[PDB]
Each structure stands twice: as structure tokens, then as C-alpha cells.
Amino acid sequence: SVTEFLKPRLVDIEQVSSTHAKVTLEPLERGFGHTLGNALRRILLSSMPGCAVTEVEIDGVLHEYSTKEGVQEDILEILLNLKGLAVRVQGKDEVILTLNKSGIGPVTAADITHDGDVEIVKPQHVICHLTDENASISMRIKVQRGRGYVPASTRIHSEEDERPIGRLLVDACYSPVERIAYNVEAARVEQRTDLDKLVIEMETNGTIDPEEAIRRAATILAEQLEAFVD
Template sequence: MTDAVTSRIAPLEELGSYGKYEAGPFAPGYGVTLGNALRRVLLGSLEGAAITAVQITGVQQEFSSLPGVREDVVQILLNMKKIRLRSFATGRVELTLNKKGAGSITAGDITPNGQVEIVNPEQVLMTLDSDKASIEAFLVVERGVGYVSADRLEVEPDGEARPRGVMAVDAIFTPVRKVNFTVENTRVGQDVDREKLILEIETDGTITPEEAVRKAAAILVGQFAAFSGLGEAPAPAPAAAAGGNLLDLSIEDLDLPMRAYNALKRAGIVKVGQLLSALDGGEAELLKLRNFGQKSLTEVREKLVERGFDVPESTLPLDAAFDEEDDEDDSDEEVKA
């Protein structure tokens, strides 16, 4: 059992995107334990924003070149990957780049968008080498965690392949570039076996090192909270009747699978209240939605029940549980036709 010694963290140095902090004192062995945990969360579990796809007018695939542009498309995409952004949107956002005339084009030339802030506008993207040269590009920005390769981004969130000419880009969502820690001995009174943790963090500028530490610590506290409740009865799910404002919750808050979410959103069902009304009116109408089959219906019902909502009983006969994939394939064919 360890002694009850109060541990604290204090900044040693903070300069822009760099921060150095000292935490302690800790019992022997705790410095490495906490340092490793924080490092892993800082590098792999913090949410950020990144460009996930690019479409350049006149370009069908990345192994191409553009007239009047010094760099080839591969180099342009590599440069665009270096753009660091803050996204204030919950979903994807499309940015536009439209430039004409000789000169260097930077991230600052991207058309301003109130939902996205570019923190390194000086990042060079390409160079136009004549006054007649021009470029038009569309950049998709999404939120995510960690690193996602372009191969995994070749498919849209709803499961469909990206349109021809839309090039997926390796997405580096993590806002933390480097993390390093060291453990040193420290003294508390007559006890010389205590440890202190020296933590160094470098971010990409989209968040401060202090924010990164706080978010990482909150994630760890949340994960360990599950163990502190071992043996206790689980807390009851919040009842939907506890307040009418719950019906105004966005369906995004249900954490639905992307296919079901997109199908509902396309149909204009964006609030939980609308979804419950649709279920009350009969599931047969919901099953007519594109890419929304029996599997999606079951997933939606389960998510609503998990959140404590009173879900209307199913009005479908048992033999209505048809195969969703067949239904979605037929729907896709009709749309393509």
C-alpha cells in the first residue's frame, strides 16, 4: 500500500506548441506506469481533424500532372497532408481552392470556411508557373483519431466507393507530434525513494500542450472509472421521459452505424423525436429508405433502448425480416440507373 502523498503537475516550460511539465511525487514504479499510459493516449487517442480526400478539376488519378503546375499530383497531395486544421463541425466539411496566375499557392489561399480553421496557412501546396495557369480543388475535412491510411478511406462512410477523380489521402488526425518522458528520483521529507515524471509534448498547433495533457488524463480517468465500480450495480439508463428536450437530441448522439445514420439523414430524420415518430408510424416506411434494411432497423432500435427511450413495438410481421444486403444492392442499382 502506498503512502497518501499528494501529487501535482506544474509547467516547467511552455512555448507555443511545446510544453514541458513536471509531475509528482509518486511512489516507486508509478512514474513509468503513468508516463507510458499518458504517452500512448497522447499519441493515439486524441481527436483531431485532417484532410481525407481531394478532388482536383481535370485530374482522374494521383499519377497525373497538371498543365502550368510545377509539382505533380502526388507531390500536391503530400503537401496537402501537411495542412493542420481545427474543425468545429461534427461531420465532414468541404473546402475549396480556386487560384489563377503565376506564383506559389499556400494553405492560406483556400477559401475561408467558418467551420474550419487552418493553423498553418504558410504551408506551400504547389506553384503555378504561368499567368494563364489555374487550379481548382475540393478538399474534404473530417474528424477522427490517430492515423488512417488512404486505403481505408477509399470507401465512403456509407459503404459506397468514392466517385472517380476523388483521391483518398492518408489522414493524420492526431494533434500530438512528439511525446517524451523521463523518470527521476525525488525526495519527500526523509523519503528519498519517491519519483517525479518529466513530460515533454509537442503538438501540431491545433491544440496547446496543456490541453493535450488534460484531454489525455480525462480519457485515462474515464477508462479506469469502470474498474472502480467493480461489484456495484450498473447505473440505470436515462429514461427518455426525464425531459422533453431529449427528443431534440441529434441522431448523431445515438452513435449509430454510419450506414443507418446516412440513410436517416438523407431522409431528413435528424432528431431523436423524428426517429421515434417514424417508428411509431410504422417501420415499413423506414425500410423503403435507401440503404436502410432490417439490420439497420434493428441497430436503430437497440441504440434507442440503450439510451433509455421508450421504443414503439414492432408492427412488422415476422416474415418481414428480409435480407438487408439484397435490398441495398437493389437500391444501389436503381440509383445508378
């Protein structure tokens, strides 16, 4: 017929690690693999909701280039480490966590105060290296539920909300997707070979399974076309 279209049946999913997926789909209509891969990649990159750190308050530090004698790492390193942390906040939009550590300083994410609702996927994720014995670190972390990637450069404008000193803006990175790529290869069925095969390689920060992220992206894209369906 004319309305019938080929659907990918050889759904092969192999997990390199707990947060790494390589999904192969075939057969596909000529050129359809590119559309599917691009749409899924765009939705994953700029449309996946998630909870992540937004701004960080550090006691004794007033600026990004300020230096703390207690920690061997710079403030920029601390901001990068906090940005790399993945959270699974549920229930409410934004949560405030308090971190207080002293003594030996292999301070990881496990030392954060547990609020019950908040969840930490990787408690062993290192945060800072306090070398001095008596030096102590105290900080406040704000986590918000947003969508996509929100760099601090855009949030620099309209500073009236962040008027109090000691608050440093960090990149949000709400979407739990990193290194999402798609490749299209030749596939042969019977006599036809113009069909395409789509290989999607993706990783997640650990909040959700990569296949769960793919399912959520596909569901979002499908429900975005509900009014246009026949």
C-alpha cells in the first residue's frame, strides 16, 4: 500500500555500563533514521527535565576568583565539582542543602545533609580536598528543577534577584544526558538496501537509565504531535 511504512524490528540494546547505552534499530525507511536520530538528540539535549544545582553560597568566599586557604582546590574547581553532581529531587521545585565538614578533607557528596526527599545517585562523588586538620568548610547548595541547559552567562543579567553577596552562579545542566550521538548505516532487507539502520549511543549522569531517558524523549515528542495526529 501507500500508508504502510517499515518499522524497526531488530531492536538491539547493549549496556556498556550502568549509564551507557548503544541501541541499534533496523530496518528503517530511506532517510527516516536521520530524522529520528536528530529529533531524539535535540529532545534529549534541550528538552529533558531534571533537577540540578543552580547557585552556590560559600561562607568566607565572596567572588569566583576568591581563594580559600582551607581547601587545596580553587573556587572554580569547587563549582565544577558541584556542577558535576547529579541529584534526584522530587516533590518540590527547589531545595536547599547545607554542607559542613571538618577534620580530614576527602569531602565527597556523602557528607551532604540528608533532607529525606532529596536523593544522591553518587554519594562517593568527590567535592573538595581539605588538607588542613582544623580547617572547616560550610556551604549552601540550591537545587532547582528545570529543563535543558541554562548557562550562568544568561543568568548573569537581571542581577537584582542575586543581589546578596556570596552567591555564585553555576551552570544548571538540568538534562541528565551527555554524549548523545546517532549514526546512520546501510541496511539490507531482501532486495532493497536503501533502508537505513540507526545506532544511538547515549550516557546519563545516573539519575535515570539511558533507555528510560530515550523512552521519555520519545513520549514527549509523540505527545507534542497529539493535536496533529489523524
